[PDB]
Every structure is written in C-alpha cells, then in structure tokens.
Amino acid sequence: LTYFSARKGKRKTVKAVIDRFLRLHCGLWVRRKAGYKKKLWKKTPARKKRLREFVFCNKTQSKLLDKMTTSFWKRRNWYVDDPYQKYHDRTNLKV
Amino acid sequence: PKFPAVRLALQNFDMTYSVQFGDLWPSIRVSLLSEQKYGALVNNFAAWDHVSAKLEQLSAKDFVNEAISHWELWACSPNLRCFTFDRGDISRFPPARPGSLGVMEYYLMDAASLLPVLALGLQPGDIVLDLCAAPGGKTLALLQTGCCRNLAANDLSPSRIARLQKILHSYVPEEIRDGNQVRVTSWDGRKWGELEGDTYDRVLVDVPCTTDRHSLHEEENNIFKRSRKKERQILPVLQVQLLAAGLLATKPGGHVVYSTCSLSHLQNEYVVQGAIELLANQYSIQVQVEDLTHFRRVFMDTFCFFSSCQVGELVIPNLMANFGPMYFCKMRRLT
Amino acid sequence: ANFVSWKSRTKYTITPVKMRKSGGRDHTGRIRVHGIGGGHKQRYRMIDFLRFRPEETKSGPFEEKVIQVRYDPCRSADIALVAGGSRKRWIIATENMQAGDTILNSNHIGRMAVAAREGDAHPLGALPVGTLINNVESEPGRGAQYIRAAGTCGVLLRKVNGTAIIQLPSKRQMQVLETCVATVGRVSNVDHNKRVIGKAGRNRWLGKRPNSGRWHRKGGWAGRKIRPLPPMKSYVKL
Amino acid sequence: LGQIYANNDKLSKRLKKVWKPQLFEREFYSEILDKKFTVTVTMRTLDLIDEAYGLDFYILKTPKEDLCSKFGMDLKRGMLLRLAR
RNA sequence: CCUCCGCAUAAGCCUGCGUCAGAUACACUGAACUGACAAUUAACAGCCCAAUAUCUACAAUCAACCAACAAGUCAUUAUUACCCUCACUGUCAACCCAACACAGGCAUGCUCAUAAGGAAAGGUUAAAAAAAGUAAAAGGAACUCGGCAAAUCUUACCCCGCCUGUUUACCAAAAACAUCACCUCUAGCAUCACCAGUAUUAGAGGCACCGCCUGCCCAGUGAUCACUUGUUCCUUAAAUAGGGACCUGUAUGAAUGGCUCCACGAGGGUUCAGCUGUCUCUUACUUUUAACCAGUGAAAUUGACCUGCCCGUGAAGAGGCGGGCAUAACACAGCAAGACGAGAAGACCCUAUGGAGCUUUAAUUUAUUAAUGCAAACACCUGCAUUAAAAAUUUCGGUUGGGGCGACCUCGGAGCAGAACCCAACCUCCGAGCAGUACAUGCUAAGACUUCACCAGUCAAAGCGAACACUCAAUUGAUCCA
RNA sequence: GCUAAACCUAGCCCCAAACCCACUCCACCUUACUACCAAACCUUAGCCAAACCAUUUACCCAAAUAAAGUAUAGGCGAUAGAAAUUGAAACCUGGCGCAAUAGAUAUAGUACCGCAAGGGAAAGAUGAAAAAACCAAGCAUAAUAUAGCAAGGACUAACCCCUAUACCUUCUGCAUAAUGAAUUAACUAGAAAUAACUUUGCAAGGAGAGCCAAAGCUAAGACCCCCGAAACCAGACGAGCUACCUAAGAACAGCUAAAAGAGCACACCCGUCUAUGUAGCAAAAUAGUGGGAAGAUUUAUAGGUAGAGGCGACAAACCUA
Ligand SMILES: C[S@@+](CC[C@H](N)C(=O)[O-])C[C@H]1O[C@@H](n2cnc3c(N)ncnc32)[C@H](O)[C@@H]1O
Ligand SMILES: [Mg+2]
Ligand SMILES: [Mg+2]
Ligand SMILES: [Mg+2]
Ligand SMILES: [Mg+2]
Ligand SMILES: [Mg+2]
Ligand SMILES: [Mg+2]
Ligand SMILES: [Mg+2]
Ligand SMILES: [Mg+2]
Ligand SMILES: [Mg+2]
Ligand SMILES: [Mg+2]
Ligand SMILES: [Mg+2]
Ligand SMILES: [Mg+2]
Ligand SMILES: [Mg+2]
Ligand SMILES: [Mg+2]
Ligand SMILES: [Mg+2]
Ligand SMILES: [Mg+2]
Ligand SMILES: [Mg+2]
Ligand SMILES: [Mg+2]
Ligand SMILES: [Mg+2]
Ligand SMILES: [Mg+2]
Ligand SMILES: [Mg+2]
Ligand SMILES: [Mg+2]
Ligand SMILES: [Mg+2]
Ligand SMILES: [Mg+2]
Ligand SMILES: [Mg+2]
Ligand SMILES: [Mg+2]
Ligand SMILES: [Mg+2]
Ligand SMILES: [Mg+2]
Ligand SMILES: [Mg+2]
Ligand SMILES: [Mg+2]
Ligand SMILES: [Mg+2]
Ligand SMILES: [Mg+2]
Ligand SMILES: [Mg+2]
Ligand SMILES: [Mg+2]
Ligand SMILES: [Mg+2]
Ligand SMILES: [Mg+2]
Ligand SMILES: [Mg+2]
Ligand SMILES: [Mg+2]
Ligand SMILES: [Mg+2]
Ligand SMILES: [Mg+2]
Ligand SMILES: [Mg+2]
Ligand SMILES: [Mg+2]
Ligand SMILES: [Mg+2]
Ligand SMILES: [Mg+2]
Ligand SMILES: [Mg+2]
Ligand SMILES: [Mg+2]
Ligand SMILES: [Mg+2]
Ligand SMILES: [Mg+2]
Ligand SMILES: [Mg+2]
Ligand SMILES: [Mg+2]
C-alpha cells in the first residue's frame, strides 16, 4: 500500500478491501464465502446454505485488513437503518 | 502434434496392405478415409414394430430379415433387426431418441459388427461370454436376441466398461439386468481360463486390434503413437492369449467367434492358427474351424467379402457399402 | 547537405562540360543507389534530342551536314556533330552515318508517304508503316526519350486517325500522335551487347562498384499460407 | 495531437494520433476593403461566415481567441481603421 | 666505426640545447632546469581580379609514325568602365601524432651514398640458464603432429577455388567474399540521386571464366482436317442429356545439374632429388644477457609468520593438528617439486519470473508508408474503414543426464507407518474429469470435524413447512469480468 | 631523531529579506575576438512499480488547514485521486549548520584529460612586529642463535618446560574449504506509519474549529541500512582513426617481355611463417622470411554520409585503442 502519498503525505486505503469486507466497530471483519455465486446447480443444499453466509475473519486476517484501511473506515457510524447495527458491540466477552 | 499419429497409420497400412490386397487396396484405401455407413439396430425392449415402420419410411431395408429368407435355399442368432440403406446411398439415419417406455428406439453402429454376433448361432438358455465387451455394440446385440440365460461382460479398462454401463442402462431395462443375469467385470481376460473352465456354451472374443478405421481418423489415444509402439509389437502375442483364454472357458462342443477390426493377416489368420497350435500342445485340446462359405454367400448383397482367407471371413470396406473391416472366425471345441 | 548538382549550364554548347560524379549519393549525402563510384573522369557533351529545332529567325524543313561521328563516354550510342547554317549541335548517330552525310529534318506530314532514308528525321505521319525508327517523342515537340540506346530500333506498327502505334524495343506498344518526330533507322554501335568486359577491372573503369557479399535467400518472397492449407506443408519423408 | 486505443478498448495498444482539418482555397470579398482575397479555410469558418451574414461581419464580430488567425486580426485592424477614419 | 640516412618544402607545434646569471630515468655544478636579455627583415610563399552578353568538336604519352580505349589535366571575343602602386601576414629551434628525449606513424623534391648526419661498448669478469650468430667428424629427416627452423634453393601430382583482387585494425588471408561470363526478377520514363541516362538501358538479385552434354503438362487418336473432349450460356422444376459459341494472329522450356580442362595460389595433402646440428649426440667460439663494482631506480604481490621431514588424521588434500624424527645462527648464486604459486582472460554445467543481438508460422499493434473503397470537396487534401509492406513493444512456466522421441503437473485408491492422527520425496501400478433416481436435491438452526496455514471442504440435534437434508472413492476451478 | 604530527580561518550551508545583471577606447557570427561591398513555434519517451509484461504506474500552476485518502478512477490489480465547503496574520540582518578528506567542485570551472560534447583536481597554517618538548604507520638508535598462529601458565632467569588448528564472511550443517584484508590515519552504512505498550493531563467526555469517543481522548517516548550490473529512453557531440564516396593532386628505379588487372625485382603498400618481446621500443612492435608492387594500385589535401543510423568485394567488418 501507499504509506505516504505524493500529494498529501498520508496513508492510503486499499479500495479492494472496502469492496469486499465490512468492518464492525468492535474490530471484527465480515466477508462472503468464495464461490457462493458459482455453479450452484452442482452443489448440495447444505453446501449452498454454507456459502450463503456472512462469516468473520481470523485475527491475522483482521490485522491485515486493519493495516490496509485508514482510520476513517474504523469510526463509529450511526446509520439510520443499519442491519448490522447490533453487531457493532460485543456482549459478555471474557478475554 | 509435431507429427500426426494418423500419418503413421497411413504409412504403416500402405506398405503392408498394398502387397496383401494388390489392386483391391486402392478401393479399400479410399473407403477407409471416407465416411462410414451406419446401420440402425432396433432395440427389442423398445417398440420394435413402430421403429421398423418408421425406418422403412426412410427407405431403409432390414438386411438380416432378407438374409434369413435366403438362409434355407445351424441357424443365425434370432431377434436381430438392422436397417441399412441400399448400395450407393449415402443417407444418414436421424439421431436416436428415448422411447415411451424410457429406452432408446435404435442403436447406430457398424452393420459389419453384427456379423460376429450372427455367426455365433445363439440358442435360448445359453451361457455366453464376451471377453472384450466395452464400449458396446456387439454385447448389446447379444442381449437383443434374448437367448442369453447368463451374459458376462469383461474389459480390462474400467473407463470403457463405464461407457458400457451407460449403454446398457439406456437400452436394456433393469428387469433384464438382474442378479447374475448380466454380469459386468473389469478384470484381465487372459487369466479367464484359470478363473472358470468349461462354463460357457458360446464365447465372443473381440481382441484389441490396430483399429484401422479409428486410427486413421481419431488422433487421441492412437495405437500408432510412438509412445504406444511397444504395445503394437506385443499385440499379436496378446491377441493369441485372449483367444486361447476364451477357448478354455468354453465347454466341449461349444462354439467361439474371433472378431478383429483390422485388415492385417497377422492379427486375423495367424492368431487363429496360433491359438489352435498353442491349445493343442499345452492343454491338449482340439479345435475345429467351422466353414462360413454359406454365411459369406448369404450376406453378399450388403457386404463385400475378401475371398482369399484360409480361415474366417474378412469384410473389406467398399465405397458403395462403407462398412468397417470385420474379420470373424467361428470354431468349435471338439474336446 | 553541401551537394550542388553539376547540371547548371543554361546555354547549349558543343564544348564538353566538366561533370561531377555522384557516387550514388543524394543531396542529403546518403546512398540511394549502390554499385556506383569512381571510374574514369568524363566530360558531358550536350545532346540536342529535338531533331526538328529550326534555327533563330528560321522555320520549315532544314538540312544538316555530318561533320564527324564520335564515341561518347556518357552513353552506349555514338554521337554525331552536325552543322546547319551557322549552328553546330550534337545528335545521336544512326547505324550507317558517316562524315559528309547530309540529313534532313522536316515537320511536313505528307499525304503520300515519303521514302524513309536512314539519316533523316520525320513526323510519324510522314513515315510509312513498318519502318524502323528511333529517338521518338511521347508528346509533340517534347524531345526524344524512348529509343536512344545503341542498336535499338522501334517499329511503326500502324497509323489510325492522327494516332500511331509504335513498338518500343521491349515489345510494348505505345500510342503517339502523328505530329511527333522520329529519326529513321537503327541507332549506332550495333553489337554493343556483344562487347566483352573481360575483367573486373574494366567495370571499375566504367564506374561500377562490386556487388554486396551478403547472401540473399531469394529475390522473390514465399507464398503466404491460407487458413486451411497449413497441414499440407512440411511433409517429412519416412 | 493525442493518443488513441487501438480498437476503442483500453486493454489494447496506445498509439499517437493526429487529427487534421480539411482545407480549401476559397475566394472572399470584403466590401469594407473593396478587395477579393484567396484564403485557406475550413467548412467551420464558411458556416461561421454564413451565420454572421458575410465575411466583414464575421471578422468584426469574432474576437481574437475564436479567430485564431494573425491574418484575421490584420483584416480586423484594416476594417476598424476604415470605419474609424 | 656506422649511415635504411641526410638537406629543403608542405603539414603540425609554438620559442622548446642563442647570450648572461643563479639553485643544483648516470653525470658533468652542466643541463634542453630557473630568471633576464636578445631574435625570424622579401624578391620566396600567402593575400587576387569591374560589368553584360558571347566563344571554347579534334587528349596525354619526347607527339612524330603506329596503335587505341577507360575518351581525357589548362583557349576567348564585342562593347562599356578603368590610371593610384610595392601595403599587410609566415620566415626561430635539437620541432609533429603516439601519456615519455618512445626500435612505432609521418606527403613531396633533391641527394641514391654521401660534401650531409651519427656512435653499438659506465667499469670489470668470462659461471649456469636464456637470446641472436658462426663452424663442425661420420651419417643425412633416423627429428617431429608436420623438413618447423636452418641449409639448400627442387620434381611430379591430388583436393579446393578459374584467374588479378578483398576480408575479421589487435589470435582465422582461407576452401570465405568479390570477379569476367551466364541466368532470374523489376521498370515505358525528364530538371537534386538513378540521370542531364532510356529496354544493346537502369535497378534488385543468383551463380561463378571459357569449353562439352543436359530442354516440353503447346488436347488425343484416325485420315491442315472431322470429333468429343475442355471451357462458357440456355432448355430442363432443376437435372441427367440435348441445343448454340470458342479452343487456329502463338509455343519453346533450367536464378536447373554433371563433366573434363589452361593458367594461377604465403590455400590443404602426398612425393622425387639434393641439402643441412632437425636428429643420432652434441661441441667450440663471438655478441647480448649474466655476475661483481659505481650511479639512478620500478611492477605484479603481501592476514600475521619465530615459515622443516616421515607416517597418520582431516570424504581428497597439512610448514602450522597427532605420533615419531630433525634442528647454532646468518648471506650470495642456481633450481622449479610444493606453497590447490601470482595476474587477468577464459572454456563447462546450473540459476535469475537479469539483459541484449538475430529469426519467425510467438503474442499485441498498424501510429508510418502504399493501395483501395466510402464520406467531404468540387485530380489533391481531410475523416473513416479494409488490404499489404515495413517495422515496433514484449515474452519464451515447472519436473524428467544433458540431447532427440516421449511422459508428467489437479483429484481418488494400494504398496505405505504393522496398533490414535500425520508422515516414504523420487519411483511401480491403478483409476476420475461422469452418471443414475428424486423434484421439499424446501427453509432455518445448537453443537462439531477439517487434508497439518488461509481459501476451500464435511457432519448434524431441535424448529417451520412437507411426507406417511439420494447411490457412488474421486466424478472438479477462486477473484475479476460478461 | 628522521619522516612526520598539531593548528584556525579562508570560505561555504540553510533561512529571512529584497524582484538582479548590462559603454574606458578598440576588436568580436568570416577560421569569433578579423576597419572597409549586390530564417523560430510542432503530444516527451523511458527507467521504474505491478515481484514477468502487454492497459496502467504520484511528479508546481497559484499558495496554510480542514473536508479526505472521502466521492471517484483502475489488467476494479499495482495503484491513482478530487471538488462543493471551511479557513489563512504577517517584527530580515538568524542558526542545539560545516570548519580545509567537512562545508560549494572551487585557492578554479583553473591545471590536467578528451577531436568534440564533456569530465574535472589537489592544496594553506610563525609572531604585535621577519625594517626582529612529547605522539600513527615506516624507519634509525639497536640484525640474528634448536621449536613451530607467535601467546598463555609460568619462572631466579628473554628463550628452553607444559598448554594452545589466525580473524571476517558464505554455503541447508561443518571448518580446517572458499571469500576479504600490506599497514597507518581520516572518511564510510536503520530514515516512517497504522495498531499496540509506557508515562503525564483532562475525563463521559478529550482536543487551541475539522477528528474521535459504549473510558475515552490529548501529548510525549519508543520499530524499519550501505555499496555494485549488464541494460532502456531523451537530448547533444563525433568520419583529423577507420568503411565508402566527392573535388582537384602526387608517386611508381632497373631487367624480361608483342606488350597484359604479364613475370623478376627497388622505393612504396601489405602482413605468410618463425624467433624475440609479453608492465615490451610498442595498449600489436622488432629481425629474418614472405604477398603485391602501371593498378579492382599506393598516397597527401579539402568536403560528405551519424547511431531506431551510417558504411560494408558480409568479416556481424569498420564508425577516435
Ligand atoms: C477393439 S476393442 C473391442 C471392440 C468392442 N467389442 C466393440 O465392438 O465396440 C478391444 C477391447 O479389449 C480391451 N482389452 C485389451 N486387452 C485386454 C485384456 N487383456 N483383457 C480384457 N480386455 C482387454 C481393450 O481395452 C478394448 O476395450
Ligand atoms: Mg555513364
Ligand atoms: Mg554473393
Ligand atoms: Mg630558459
Ligand atoms: Mg612574390
Ligand atoms: Mg659527417
Ligand atoms: Mg652507447
Ligand atoms: Mg655493461
Ligand atoms: Mg649457455
Ligand atoms: Mg656435420
Ligand atoms: Mg619419420
Ligand atoms: Mg628425402
Ligand atoms: Mg620418432
Ligand atoms: Mg621453412
Ligand atoms: Mg651452418
Ligand atoms: Mg581465388
Ligand atoms: Mg596481381
Ligand atoms: Mg591473390
Ligand atoms: Mg585488412
Ligand atoms: Mg586478425
Ligand atoms: Mg594472420
Ligand atoms: Mg564464392
Ligand atoms: Mg594463399
Ligand atoms: Mg639474475
Ligand atoms: Mg647496483
Ligand atoms: Mg607497488
Ligand atoms: Mg600429509
Ligand atoms: Mg604435527
Ligand atoms: Mg636463494
Ligand atoms: Mg599455509
Ligand atoms: Mg526478464
Ligand atoms: Mg526489463
Ligand atoms: Mg485446519
Ligand atoms: Mg502433503
Ligand atoms: Mg430434523
Ligand atoms: Mg516489473
Ligand atoms: Mg574542499
Ligand atoms: Mg574537492
Ligand atoms: Mg611511531
Ligand atoms: Mg612447543
Ligand atoms: Mg587478498
Ligand atoms: Mg569529413
Ligand atoms: Mg576523412
Ligand atoms: Mg573524383
Ligand atoms: Mg617500373
Ligand atoms: Mg603485375
Ligand atoms: Mg610480381
Ligand atoms: Mg574495402
Ligand atoms: Mg559469414
Ligand atoms: Mg558469424
Ligand atoms: Mg571506441
């Protein structure tokens, strides 16, 4: 990535990550399963259900995605009707 | 490919078949390179009466029906119907469809391929062996007769035997393919003698050949490939083993047919002669070759024959009747 | 570059003119033509290719006397100095032209075809069909350009309507107006083609530099392969 | 003077391209100057003349940035001086 | 005693061995070093010219015979205009281009051995090895890859290339290139090449003198001519097969192949005769070098060294490690067995998602050029499209001695971890790239497994809705994009 | 005690401010520095990044900040990237800059090198007045005595005795293998973020507008080297060597020859073979022997052809070793 811009001298976001991932404020990243739109005719209903899921990422994956995005993408957003609003905060988490 | 495999076949055939056939070779050569004439073998499990009428509308004639009429001017395998066009007609049959019962009406295959099946004088309640059944055609025709009490299908390659399963399912109902009624195996045919001896009334042996028609056209998995040159050299040896193996399995008084797709007298006549010699010495079993002069005479109308074979009958391709080469030799185990 | 053509003379003269060799180079200074350079020094003799050029304050057919017939370095053909009135000029000599010969130049087209003597220059209209001709003009009063090499003769094939078909020495027919003037007969120095150079040194004297030592595959290209035909190439014998 | 993509696709090769106007020698009459001029024009300027209702109107109305001709400016000066004097 | 040099001009350089006075790559306290002073004097050479028209066919070679070919190195006139003179500059040298006072490079005239110009030896001794010479008994190529070198001055061939000529400046002079002659292809023409040319010409090429052989896809028989045939039309639904027209102004074929042959060659091979220290088998002498004395005084190289031998060890290989042995310390001259002796430059194999040159039937292009068509405009130009030529940019996956012909790269099974899991590279074998039956092969959801990561992949309680989460070992493909 | 060592100040660096230069006379675009005669405007490409490469890959444009690395763009990859909107305070003569290997290359664009464009140095130190001590390497004073990584344990005693396989770096691991070092002095190589941690301030708020915040926010501290290709492109400079050509020149003794790209053979041109030489006389020479020597010959002068190119009797030859 661009650590320092030529114009502003600022860290840049990788726009690929924004197109593919959602960041929850708590630090988790959400993604679609790969190949969920692909060749559904030859796939079992159980497998199709597994594919049609929003899944969280590894610690290592999360750390990668954090570095590849600026602080703007990590801010608390109060969207008017956000389907992922409840998932922004963690409850009853011990260590 | 840097050098086509089909070119090797042409080079190989020209040097050997020219001397074998003389002035006949040009006629055979042009026919081999030209488009193969096909016969429609009607599925008996389907509506045989309706299909026969339909194919008659396309100006196709059942040659075997005509053959049966002129037979009595042993008996051939019954319940076989194959429609072919008249001499000099290039007409193609329409692609086959599924029927009302859910089985396909007819099977498009080489008409000459039925001759080995017809040569084998199938009788009701006969235990029959096919050492090299895959991909099908011949073994399908065995089932069409309905004279097979127990049929065994064998082939070394499970890839090709898988194709047979598809053909059997499409054409033959599950009722007919009951337990031990039709047996399908993927084992070596050479070791069949020690597996079971004096089991089968009739054995059809269709050894691997150079596949003259197929080798000239299809590049993929060609026998004339330099990688497969070692296979070609050991092929005459391998052919004898299989024919011998079939003879062991046959009960005394039983009949076998040896079918080969090649023009080569090396893979036709010498294999038959060699198998008899091998069996007579090693196992002390006598084989009597049954004459097919009457058989060749009956089928002169549809198929042209090369009248110079010491043993068996060779069907040569003609541009009038472009039927693929077929060498069938019928012989009986005396002991 | 600094190249200036030697062809600067504006006034015709019979005096041999000093000429500069090119070497096959341009004004730019780069080679355009290979195999030219450094023969024997030559002097240019200006040739009047317009045979029917009437003198100043004169018109109509005129006669000239051949003073001498002379070798020319610049061309294959021999040249003749010819005098008429108070004018001397260089012309291209015919096959049989001698000193003392008298030659006529006319612009008169005859209703009855005039007898064609070898030395004389006439309009093609005047000349009979089948006469060997030389020094022809494409356009009336343009000047001779076409048959001027040694031992070369054109044939007046036919004359239609104010037009004439001539055969150039390459056996190619050319349409020419009847008013155009040609010189009768064959050009001098016949059997020029029969000359033998004999040694490499002679061509060097003539100003011809030796051919490149590079080996070329073929003068003509290879036939381009069409889409279905490629399998039919590169057959290997076994 | 610009660049183009080979077959109007950015994935193909980028090439230098020059678009040139079509040029015509045409005769024009100035009634202010009472003179005929042979000038190299395009179809655009002919259409501009037509809409301005004559060469004189075209020259006088059109500013310097639109004319883009030194000769046009000289014509303009000529006509303005004629009108002034 | 040498002179293969000299003197001058040109070119180049620019005061660079004249005088005086000083300090001081052999040296003179003298040098060409430092400072000051002086000097090359034009007749030689350079530096030229009023205008406008106009004139100038006939070489040179003792220029006379004779003979040419490659065709040549020097000429004015008419009219107008015209009266002031000897200015300016080079002129030196022991000299220039080669980093140097360099065995090299350097045009011309005269001298063709000097009338001009120079000195091979610092002094000594007379070792080895090294270099150049001279002489050699008897033998005469026995030497050697080879008569290389030397001596002697030689024959007859073979191969290659006709020949003279040219080529890798600095490892190849040749059989390579060119070359007369021959052959093929292209072109019907002017004012900047070709060319002030024109088809007996010009350009692009091939082959290599000459000389001798090698030449038909021109329609077949029968007696220039009839007739099917070939080609085109029409009839025929359309054809089969019938009706009509033409093939009768001419054609040659090979940038084809072989064959001797004269001359020639620093070409490659063989050979006769002689000859010679090449050799048997080496020796003597001279010069250089050498060593010593005097002066001046480098370079590669160098971890530090107080730097031995034998055997062993270190996969070979030890001055230095182990066991033995040896051993006062220092020069000088030889030597090349070791110090994987020293300096570059190699040759071989492999590697790099490192380069570059060349080729093409690699991919991507047609910006350029040429032609064509369609617009515009009333042939050129412009825009668009198409076709070619010419290029341009970029690349050349992995395994398998290395090379050719092959094979292989993903998934499943066995040898194969004897018993949780995992794990046997390479190899030896097999198979897979489907298919069949449903059509709730609907929806949703606890908990789990996981091919050692991730991505993927797998099982499933309960519930909603139905009914009374298929078989098969694999039977498969992310993102983008459409 | 020699060679040496030592020094402080010429000057320079970054800013700030301020808008610079420009005739004694004479000469100077022709061969510049020579008194005096008939024609400019015209897309940069490429390296490089994408771990190849082919679309693509930041580069000033009218002045801070913030919006914002946001909208957007993009083999939607690498990466590129706005605007609406907000808002800007003005004191030159200073330095936690260098001090002769530093700071300018500079004592000077000089000497020197190169045909040219072009490259490009080194160095000085007395005192108010010159009209006045010791220390690097290398050596010398003062060569050496069995034996061995040069020392250590020691010892009365330098050595003798006993113990001890130089240093660095590389290879999957190993050194003893290989790499690098004559020695001395000077010079010569870890630059920054998100996120975390530590220490303060304030605290459901923090921050000297923007931004963040379900104990956070603000501030500080604390992590990211040096040298080296063959290349590619753009713009200049080169044909005084050489390849070829153009203009106008010059040279070729003697002897045999019906007389010549003839023969022998000088000068001249070339370079077959051997020997010498190999930091040489020489970055290609010398001696002998050779090939040619009236010609497709050799050679002096001036001019021309220029790198996506020239030129070539093709050797991938030559185009300033
Ligand atoms: C020429 S094909 C038979 C043609 C087939 N019957 C037909 O008509 O379509 C021969 C077959 O025999 C098989 N085969 C070869 N060797 C065999 C063996 N040893 N035992 C059994 N089958 C064998 C081949 O794999 C091949 O499928
Ligand atoms: Mg000429
Ligand atoms: Mg050639
Ligand atoms: Mg002096
Ligand atoms: Mg004078
Ligand atoms: Mg003297
Ligand atoms: Mg001396
Ligand atoms: Mg001496
Ligand atoms: Mg000696
Ligand atoms: Mg002797
Ligand atoms: Mg011998
Ligand atoms: Mg002898
Ligand atoms: Mg010997
Ligand atoms: Mg010799
Ligand atoms: Mg002697
Ligand atoms: Mg020759
Ligand atoms: Mg010669
Ligand atoms: Mg020669
Ligand atoms: Mg040479
Ligand atoms: Mg050489
Ligand atoms: Mg040589
Ligand atoms: Mg040749
Ligand atoms: Mg030679
Ligand atoms: Mg010595
Ligand atoms: Mg000495
Ligand atoms: Mg040194
Ligand atoms: Mg040892
Ligand atoms: Mg030891
Ligand atoms: Mg010694
Ligand atoms: Mg050592
Ligand atoms: Mg690369
Ligand atoms: Mg590259
Ligand atoms: Mg796992
Ligand atoms: Mg594994
Ligand atoms: Mg359930
Ligand atoms: Mg890259
Ligand atoms: Mg400095
Ligand atoms: Mg400096
Ligand atoms: Mg010291
Ligand atoms: Mg010791
Ligand atoms: Mg070293
Ligand atoms: Mg020049
Ligand atoms: Mg020159
Ligand atoms: Mg000339
Ligand atoms: Mg002479
Ligand atoms: Mg000669
Ligand atoms: Mg000679
Ligand atoms: Mg040459
Ligand atoms: Mg070559
Ligand atoms: Mg080569
Ligand atoms: Mg150079």
Q: Is the peptide bond before B78 cis (omega within 30 degrees of 0)?
A: no
Q: How many Å does it take to go from CA C127 to C1' E231?
A: 44
Amino acid sitting at position B314? L
Sign of CA dihedral D56, D60, D62, D68: positive
B67, two tokens: 């053959």
Sequence-distant (6+) residues with CB within 8 A of B2 are: none
Give dist(CA A23, CA B238) in Å, integer: 69
Same domain membership, residue B103 and residue B10 = yes
Please tell me which residue lies nearest to nucleotide E388, judged from CA to C1'.
C224
Is there an atom of ligand 1 within 6 Å of B188 CB?
yes
Domain ranges in chain C are: 1-106, 107-187
Give dist(CA B86, CA C57) in Å, integer: 101
Q: Give the annotated binding-site residues of B for S-adenosyl-L-methionine.
A: 136-138, 155, 160, 188-189, 206
The last residue of a domain, from among B65, B87, B109: B109
Q: Are the beta carbons of A71 and A12 closer than 8 angstroms?
A: no
Same domain membership, residue B149 and residue B60 = no
Strand partners, B259: B206, B328
User: Residue B306, class by beta-carbon neighbours within 10 Å (0-12 exposed, 13-18 middle, 19+ buried)?
Assistant: middle
The last residue of a domain, from among B80, B109, B138: B109
Strands, E, within B72-214: which ranges? 82-84, 106-109, 126-130, 148-154, 182-185, 200-206
Give dist(CA B27, CA B318) in Å, integer: 6
The last residue of a domain, from among B87, B109, B131: B109
Number of domains in chain B: 2
Ligand 1 site-directed mutation target among B36, B132, B140, B190, most atoms within 8 Å of CB: B132
Q: Which nucleotide is closest to the Cα of D13 by its C1'?
A: E365
Domain carrying residue B231: 110-335
Q: Are the beta carbons of B100 and B333 closer than 8 angstroms?
A: no
Element containing residue A16 per DSSP (H, E): helix A15-20
User: Strand D24-30 to strand D35-41: parallel, antiparallel, or no bridges (unpaired)?
Assistant: antiparallel
Angle CA B24–B27–B32, to nearest 5: 120
Is there an atom of ligand 1 within 6 Å of B167 CB?
no
Same domain membership, residue B265 and residue B173 = yes
Give dist(CA C26, CA C11) in Å, integer: 25
Architecture of domain C107-187: Roll (2.30)
Task: Point out the ligand 1 atom lying closest to the alpha carbon of residue B207.
Answer: 10
User: Strand B126-130 to strand B148-154: parallel, antiparallel, or no bridges (unpaired)?
Assistant: parallel
CA-nearest residue, atom 2 of ligand 1: B208
Q: Are the beta carbons of B5 and B214 closer than 8 angstroms?
A: no
Same domain membership, residue B207 and residue B101 = no
CATH topology (fold) of C1-106: OB fold (Dihydrolipoamide Acetyltransferase, E2P) (2.40.50)
Same domain membership, residue B277 and residue B150 = yes
Q: How many Å does it take to go from CA D17 to C1' F44?
A: 15
Q: Which residue has 């196992």 as its token pair?
A: B283
Same domain membership, residue B126 and residue B59 = no
CA-nearest residue, atom 14 of ligand 1: B156
Give dist(CA C80, CA C68) in Å, integer: 6
Same domain membership, residue B115 and residue B104 = no
Using CB atoms, which chains have 3+ pairs under 8 A with D?
none
Among the listed residues B261, B304, B309, B329, the single catalytic one is B261
User: Residue C56, class by beta-carbon neighbours within 10 Å (0-12 exposed, 13-18 middle, 19+ buried)?
Assistant: exposed
Angle CA C218–C221–C222, to nearest 5: 105
Q: Are the beta carbons of B148 and B77 closer than 8 angstroms?
A: no
Closest CA to C129 of C155, C147, C168, C107: C155
Bases of chain E with protein Cβ within 7 A: 54-58, 70-73, 163-164, 177-181, 184-185, 187-194, 196-208, 255, 361, 364-368, 376-377, 381-384, 389, 405-407, 430-437, 441-445, 454-460, 469-470, 473, 476-479
Instruction: Name the structure determination technique.
Output: cryo-EM
Same domain membership, residue B78 and residue B146 = no
Q: Give the annotated binding-site residues of B.
A: 136-138, 155, 160, 188-189, 206
Same domain membership, residue B85 and residue B140 = no
Give dist(CA C102, CA C61) in Å, integer: 13
Q: Which residues of D46-75 are buried (b: 16+ CB within 10 A; e: fewer)?
A: eebbeeeeebbebbeebeeeebebeebeeb
Is there an atom of ligand 1 within 6 Å of B190 CB?
yes
- The answer to whether the C-beta of A34 is closer than 7 A to strand F is no
Sign of CA dihedral B151, B152, B158, B159: negative
Closest CA to B248 of B188, B195, B190, B197: B197
Give dist(CA C21, CA C38) in Å, integer: 7
Give catalytic status of residue B261 as yes or no.
yes
Chain centroid offset of residue A75 CA = 14
Amino acid sitting at position B27? S
Q: Which 3 state secondary structure label does DSSP give C157?
A: strand
| Distance from residue C29's CA to the centre of ligand 36 (Å) | 43
Q: How many Å does it take to go from CA A4 to C1' F204?
A: 35
